[PDB]
Design a protein around this ligand. Structure first.
Ligand SMILES: OC[C@H]1O[C@@H](OCCN2CCN(CCCN3c4ccccc4C=Cc4ccccc43)CC2)[C@H](O)[C@@H](O)[C@@H]1O
Ligand SMILES: C1=Cc2ccccc2Nc2ccccc21
Ligand SMILES: [Cl-]
Ligand SMILES: [Cl-]
Ligand code: NA
Length: 472
């Protein structure tokens, strides 16, 4: 039983637009902040790589569907490129080519028995909106509503699973470093919090829009995908446990407390630590923006499920470190990783499968067991088809998730592996491989070929259980 997926549980794979599509300026698509980063700052990216072509999924989407069908995916999670649909960011111009592309992909999926799950925003802000300041500028919340209206109107007759945002915890960091994630702006501890505030407002507007203009007719579900690492106390002390709770609240709670709790608002520890630090540093005003009571009420409850992106764990101990100002410093935890944990091709990603179970329990207890869809989980190597590390990563994480479901009563409702194929890995370019299908980026045809992990995942999806040879 503990090794069998619940009957209604949905299994599949995931991608993101800038990581796979290419066709960056084709057929009316406008420029986004990743076009800007990779074109103007190739020194920020391994090998000076760009997403100009990537997997060429703009042209090769039928090949993506073919491999999803081979895999036996029930659901395909992909994102829509805002600037492909609204090249100016604002909703004055709708690019028919973009509408046609996503309709073509959606229709191809449905014709092959695969359910689309659509992420509205996976990091590729139109440059015209970044030029207003991007996410720190609250005017983007209304622009995001207008973008979502276009998506619901055009695609919502066939798409019933939506994520507003993918991982704002990471993309807010684009406002916390001059050399980091797009748009690579150095306002740590100030502009990143403003970005979060706008994103939360935007999410809430999109959810209310769906309620008001679309839900009765379309009958779908709207969530948000949040990334979170497990944070294990470095020692069993109360003080180290406190630091791990700080981590959860500063990383997951930042977004989930306003939306998924009955109280709403930011977590108290976030408000209080930033208020105190801001006062101590001489600011008249806290660096953390505030919600009014009306806004707290508007934002809370804006969810039909919680998307979780889970990759790894950290150790947390009591203390403070980091630059002043920064969210890491504000969070009041000292973070490390255990040298004993298996490594990957990514410095940040260690293999800690039991952390996944711990995290799912933390979520269950904090948010009253919301339906959880695992929207990303995966592993990096530098290449190769005999990807035993990736196979072990998946089988262990799926086992731990299944224990969370069956032994712990966590309401996990689906899982999409990250990623369907090797793709443009942001600042890491093509140097880190997260796919279950390999892609030859030196071959203009970009063939997708299955790794051992794709074969094992196909076996899991077909049999609906963990094969015996991978059990404890
Ligand atoms: O990357 C795979 C997938 O990630 C996913 O983000 C979700 C996963 N992202 C979240 C953002 N994350 C940043 C991690 C910070 N990182 C460092 C920060 C600053 C300096 C140096 C560092 C080096 C090592 C570190 C060690 C310990 C902690 C943090 C470290 C990369 C993984 C994403 O949604 C997919 O699009 C993507 O393909
Ligand atoms: C991020 C900020 C830090 C600031 C100050 C002390 C320790 C830090 N932790 C880090 C270790 C390695 C890379 C980046 C880090
Ligand atoms: Cl201990
Ligand atoms: Cl066997
Ligand atoms: Na339209």
């Amino acid at each position: 039983t503990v090794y069998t997926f619940p009957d209604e549980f949905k299994l599949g794979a995931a991608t993101a637009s800038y990581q796979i599509e290419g066709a960056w300026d084709e057929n009316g698509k406008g420029p986004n902040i990743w076009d800007t980063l990779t074109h103007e700052h190739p020194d920020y990216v391994v090998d000076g790589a760009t997403g100009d072509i990537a997997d060429d999924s703009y042209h090769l989407y039928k090949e993506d569907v073919k491999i999803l069908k081979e895999l036996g995916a029930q659901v395909y999670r992909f994102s829509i490129s805002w600037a492909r649909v609204l090249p100016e960011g604002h909703d004055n111009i709708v690019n028919q080519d973009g509408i046609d592309y996503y309709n073509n992909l959606i229709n191809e999926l449905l014709a092959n028995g695969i359910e689309p799950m659509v992420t509205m925003y996976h990091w590729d802000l139109p440059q015209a909106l970044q030029d207003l300041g991007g996410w720190p500028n609250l005017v983007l919340a209304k622009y995001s509503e207008n973008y979502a209206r276009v998506l619901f109107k055009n695609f919502g007759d066939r798409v019933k699973l939506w994520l507003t945002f993918n991982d704002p915890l990471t993309f807010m960091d684009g406002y916390a470093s001059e050399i980091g994630m797009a748009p690579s702006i150095n306002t740590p501890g100030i502009g990143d919090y403003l970005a979060a505030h706008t994103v939360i407002h935007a999410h809430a507007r999109i959810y209310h829009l769906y309620d008001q203009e679309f839900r009765a007719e379309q009958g779908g579900k709207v969530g948000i995908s949040l990334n979170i690492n497990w944070c294990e106390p470095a020692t069993n002390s109360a003080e180290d446990r406190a630091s791990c709770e700080n981590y959860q609240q500063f990383n997951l709670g930042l977004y989930a407390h306003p939306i998924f709790t009955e109280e709403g608002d930011y977590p108290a520890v976030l408000k209080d630590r930033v208020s105190r630090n801001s006062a101590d540093e001489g600011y008249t005003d806290s660096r953390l923006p505030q919600f009014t009571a009306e806004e707290v009420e508007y934002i809370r409850g804006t969810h039909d499920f919680l998307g979780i992106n889970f990759y790894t764990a950290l150790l947390g101990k009591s203390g403070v470190e980091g630059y002043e100002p920064s969210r890491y410093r504000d969070s009041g935890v000292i973070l490390t990783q255990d040298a004993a944990w298996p490594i990957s091709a990514s410095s940040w990603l260690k293999v800690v499968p039991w952390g996944f179970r711990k995290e799912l329990n933390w979520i269950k207890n904090e948010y009253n067991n919301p339906p959880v869809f695992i929207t990303e989980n995966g592993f990096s190597d530098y290449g190769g088809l005999n990807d035993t590390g990736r196979v072990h990563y998946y089988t262990e994480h799926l086992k731990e998730m299944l224990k969370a479901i069956h032994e712990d009563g966590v309401n996990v409702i689906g899982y999409t592996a990250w990623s369907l194929m090797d793709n443009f890995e942001w600042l890491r370019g093509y140097s880190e491989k997260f796919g279950i299908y390999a892609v030859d980026f030196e071959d203009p045809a970009r063939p997708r070929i299955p790794k051992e992990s794709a074969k094992v995942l196909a076996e899991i999806m077909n049999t609906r259980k963990i094969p015996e040879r991978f059990r404890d």
